[PDB]
Amino acid sequence: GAFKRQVSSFRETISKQHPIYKPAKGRYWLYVSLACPWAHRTLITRALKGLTSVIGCSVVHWHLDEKGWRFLDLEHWHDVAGGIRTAKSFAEIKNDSQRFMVDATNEPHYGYKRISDLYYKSDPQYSARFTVPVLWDLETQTIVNNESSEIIRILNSSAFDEFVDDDHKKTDLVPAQLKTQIDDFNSWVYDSINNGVYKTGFAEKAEVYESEVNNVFEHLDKVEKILSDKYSKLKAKYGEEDRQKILGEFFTVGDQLTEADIRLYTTVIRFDPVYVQHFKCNFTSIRAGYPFIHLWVRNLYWNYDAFRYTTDFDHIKLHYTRSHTRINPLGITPLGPKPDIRPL
Amino acid sequence: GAFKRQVSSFRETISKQHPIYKPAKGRYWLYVSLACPWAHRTLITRALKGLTSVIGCSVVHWHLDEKGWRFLDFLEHWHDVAGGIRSFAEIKNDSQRFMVDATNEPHYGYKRISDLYYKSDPQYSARFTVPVLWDLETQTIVNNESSEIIRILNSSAFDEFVDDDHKKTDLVPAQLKTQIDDFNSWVYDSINNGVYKTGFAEKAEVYESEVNNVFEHLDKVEKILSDKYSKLKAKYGEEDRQKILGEFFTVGDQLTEADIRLYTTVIRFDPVYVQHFKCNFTSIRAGYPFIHLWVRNLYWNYDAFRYTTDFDHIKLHYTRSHTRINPLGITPLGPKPDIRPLLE
């Protein structure tokens, strides 16, 4: 009765040496959902690496029906969130809602209504799931890569350095000095937290649900310990009153913002708004039960534009509650918790 | 898509002057579910008024199927505060653990509470609800309205059969009667039944109206208790926690029926109503400090409350019986713990 995530099929890279996919401005596109934590990784990374004008973005609807992610039928393409803005209750919003630049964008290059149209163009024999994110090549009309862990490495690589400014080129979310630390952390966070919440919420037998939920909270406890130890050291170094200096080095790995933080964030920012109620990951919440994770996630959300302005809590809450009929059969979106993220 | 609770049909009383239903030991029986907050009112009141050996009790299974509450196929059990009732994945909906999932119906061997209803009135055609206050002599339902059963138990009706300490206990003192009734009225509509109008709503517009109403009224209760705590802190000093708590109640300065009626909802709120009925702006433990102190004082410090509160029956009943809310019948393991200790 367990959930098994399928392996992603499109696994190519972009580099000056690549025979097909070489770096250029105006060539590649990023198709995402704002509700998906995997695709969220790519949006955050695109922003932190200064690539919003280099790689355009479009956004599928938050409602996921049986035919897969769908679209509605320049300032937006090159925006951190593809131009989506949260509207100024959920009950009046139906699953077929058509608020252009609120629920979704269009697909601007071909007018496709379905993300499956891109998959079939790339591989007419494709037979797997039509997932987001998709890194798309406009020249060959193919999917370069649809594995979020690899897309973020492509984005952080030197590939696009000619087309970005001096400050962003220098940002390195996977420094060699921390690479074993990042890769370790990522491995167990993936299995027990990023994917752990899905193995918990999609379980169809309680035995699997219980095993997986225990494993989620056991690993949140590990993260919380790492952060608690780091906070102790920073408080000794700077004094607890100098909160600003403390937060400037308050990260999961090392003393700087890395990929490990990005990958954790996309799960943690969804945890209280969705995963507690909807995936039954409910021993406690981040805000009530995990002070150091809670501080860490609020620092990233409130103080980093790449996190705040790619985080759409309406897409998050509506996607899960409205799409997963075997969890929420009537599609009624809970109004709580309030607020979606507490202030810092 | 709104939930309209039926009016209870059996509304008679027991008294010395009554032509039919006079008080006696060994004559009346109380049939309950430990999951039901309405029936829970009657168990608490039965204990507080010292009536456990006067009025026997039997307990239906926590699983509620389409044919209604059911029994499984002893002196100490019948006269116990909870009828003798002593991970969830291993417990199936057809679980048959005698004295754990349910008791038997010991007078007639009925397998269904509907059997008692049809015995009393062969033309009955509403829902077969708990609690039931049953007369063994006429084989009828005296009263199936929890708000009236607790008045019967509190009345002078059974005073000849209890000790003097219990006889003097009065859960509806005259000086507080009107305030008890007025508090009870809005707590009923907005909290006791408010959580059910919220969780059983099948249209989002009704869900949202009712959930906002629940939290608006919990705010009202919290204000009452905060003001009362402030007065007690002045009367006694914050250090005298035992003297403060000895007067820390919803109406006046003593335990009343108003506390009992609020408690059966509040004790279920974090274990069930937050996740399952989507009453989730916040939780009691995180969001309502004065309600949280009040309910922990009742649970831990009054045996009539603690030893009638069965969190397995509570969690299993709701999550395993409400298929249109929880289609796969998977009981969340959290929140942990069911009720927090009263840490000073």
Residue numbers in the entry:
A (entry chain B): 11 to 83, 95 to 109, 115 to 370
B (entry chain A): 11 to 83, 94 to 106, 115 to 372
Show the paper's wording.
Glutathionyl-hydroquinone reductases (GHRs) belong to the glutathione transferase (GST) family of enzymes and catalyze efficiently the reduction of hydrophobic, bulky glutathionyl-hydroquinones. One of the most studied GHRs from a biochemical point of view is the protein ECM4 from the yeast Saccharomyces cerevisiae (ScECM4). In this study, we described the X-ray structures of ScECM4 and glutathionylated ScECM4 (ScECM4-SG). Besides the features that defined these GSTs as members of the class Xi, ScECM4 possessed a tremendously elongated loop between strand β2 and helix α2 involved in the dimer interface, two more spiral turns in helix α5 that make it 45 Å long and an additional helix α5’ with two helical turns.
Crystallization of ScECM4 was assayed by the microbatch under paraffin oil method at 278 K. ScECM4 (41 mg/mL) crystallized by mixing 1 μL of protein with 1 μL of commercial crystallization solution (Wizard I n°10 (Rigaku), consisting of 20% (w/v) polyethyleneglycol 2000 monomethylether in 0.1 M Tris-HCl buffer, pH 7.0). ScECM4 and ScECM4-SG crystals diffracted respectively to 1.45 Å and 1.68 Å according to the CC1/2 correlation coefficient. ScECM4 exhibited no GSH in the active site but rather glycerol molecules. The typical features of GSTXs were also present: a long N-terminal end (37-residues), an extended loop between β2 and α2 (V70-R140) and a unique dimerization mode by the helical domain. The visible N-terminal end starting from G11 was found to be partially surrounding the active site in ScECM4 and in monomer A of ScECM4-SG. G11 was hydrogen-bonded with E230, at the C-terminal end of helix α4. The loop β2-α2 (residues V70-R140) was the second distinctiveness of ScECM4, and probably the most striking one.
